[PDB]
Amino acid sequence: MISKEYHIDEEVGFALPNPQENLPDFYNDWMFIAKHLPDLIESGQLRERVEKLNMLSIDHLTDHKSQRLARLVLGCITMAYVWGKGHGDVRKVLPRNIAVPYCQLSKKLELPPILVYADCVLANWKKKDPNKPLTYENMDVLFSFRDGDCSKGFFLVSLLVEIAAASAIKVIPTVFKAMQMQERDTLLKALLEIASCLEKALQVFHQIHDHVNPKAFFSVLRIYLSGWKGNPQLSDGLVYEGFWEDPKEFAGGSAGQSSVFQCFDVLLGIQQTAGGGHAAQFLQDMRRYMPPAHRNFLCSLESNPSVREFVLSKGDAGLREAYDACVKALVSLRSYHLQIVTKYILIPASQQTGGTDLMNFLKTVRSTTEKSLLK
Ligand code: HEM
Ligand SMILES: CC(=O)NCCSc1nonc1/C(=N/O)N[C@H]1Cc2ccc(F)cc21
């Protein structure tokens, strides 16, 4: 079993299990704004209401779940304040009374002061009925931006792919213990289970089409998840007033900030973060947007002996085929992901070189996965 320090749940994996919905009464002013972003943004009163906040201390966020909720709350409020109605008028300064506590909490959790995948997917959910299982119909998100923004479909399908992958993650200690104890049969079984689970994760991905509309994502939801690293709208980044004097750059939310695909890249010896290209650079930089416990886990998998080199050294077709099934499952996820990028970015953008450059980046990562096949 995985060590408690890494914050990996048996059921939900890298997701925060049963995350908090309500903060203490102390932070009701934060909560009212974040719960009513659709109306507040539409009516153009969000920014005024953010500006008229008092600075609330982060000391009354006592445990990890409450601190994670606060990040999600302040994260969503921050994106609403920056992007406004999502029509091009941007705020270049985040006000003192929200920026300071958001930055203090962010330093405490070792995350950047911007909404990340870990906020808006991994901590942004609940069960409708606690006695029923983790399915779309029994689940809801905690926070959305605009009416018709498809954020429930968008965040929960990502979460459900994330949860599907958790079943493979709990096998990882079996993989390594089987290698050191020279348990061939155990290792093969473990690889066939990981492949099975990553194949299941692809079928969960199919649900995106049912619950997320292309126009709604591209025209609205993508605007609010946008960051301010290399963004012409905020050339120099965002001024976090009273915490830093100069404006800081931070990347927007992405499932590239997921620890799932990186975890199995590392496990399988798919050297994605090697080579020194844009792919490698991006994927390593994205680890800074993961929770510290999760990047520590990825660091620990890299420190372990190579599964790839173990399977190559044995002259064992069954193990090679079980290993290739895991790699091929990752290739399939990435192949399917490209089709989603086509539907959800490329076509809406055309209806409105970067598009070619984007697809070639993703194809490079997939090509590096494909190259790790043994036969
Ligand atoms: C509306 C649907 C989606 C769109 C339009 C989309 C788009 C993109 C884009 C443009 C990138 C390149 C990185 C960047 O520009 O920051 C990317 C990377 C990535 N995406 Fe998505 N994505 C979607 C859904 C998902 C989902 C649900 C997952 C799985 C949870 C996922 C997994 C990944 C991963 C792991 C990367 C990093 C590159 C890699 O490892 O292949 N994406 N995505
Ligand atoms: C918002 C923006 O422009 N980000 C930089 C470009 S990457 C991107 N865009 O939009 N979606 C992206 C995605 N990249 O893996 N997966 C989707 C799935 C998901 C969950 C949370 C999130 F916050 C994003 C996503």
Curated annotation (Swiss-Prot):
InterPro entries noted in UniProt: Indolamine_dOase (IPR000898), Trp/Indoleamine_2_3_dOase-like (IPR037217)
Main location, first listed in the record: cytoplasm
CC annotations in GO: cytoplasm; cytosol; smooth muscle contractile fiber; stereocilium bundle
Expression tissues: Expressed in mature dendritic cells located in lymphoid organs (including lymph nodes, spleen, tonsils, Peyers's patches, the gut lamina propria, and the thymic medulla), in some epithelial cells of the female genital tract, as well as in endothelial cells of term placenta and in lung parenchyma. Weakly or not expressed in most normal tissues, but mostly inducible in most tissues. Expressed in more than 50% of tumors, either by tumoral, stromal, or endothelial cells (expression in tumor is associated with a worse clinical outcome). Not overexpressed in tumor-draining lymph nodes.
GO MF assignments: electron transfer activity; heme binding; indoleamine 2,3-dioxygenase activity; metal ion binding; tryptophan 2,3-dioxygenase activity
Pathway as given in its UniProt record: Amino-acid degradation; L-tryptophan degradation via kynurenine pathway; L-kynurenine from L-tryptophan: step 1/2
Subunit structure: Monomer.
Purpose of the protein: Catalyzes the first and rate limiting step of the catabolism of the essential amino acid tryptophan along the kynurenine pathway. Involved in the peripheral immune tolerance, contributing to maintain homeostasis by preventing autoimmunity or immunopathology that would result from uncontrolled and overreacting immune responses. Tryptophan shortage inhibits T lymphocytes division and accumulation of tryptophan catabolites induces T-cell apoptosis and differentiation of regulatory T-cells. Acts as a suppressor of anti-tumor immunity.
Protein name as annotated: Indoleamine 2,3-dioxygenase 1
Species of the source: Homo sapiens
Top-level taxonomy: Eukaryota, Metazoa, Chordata, Craniata, Vertebrata
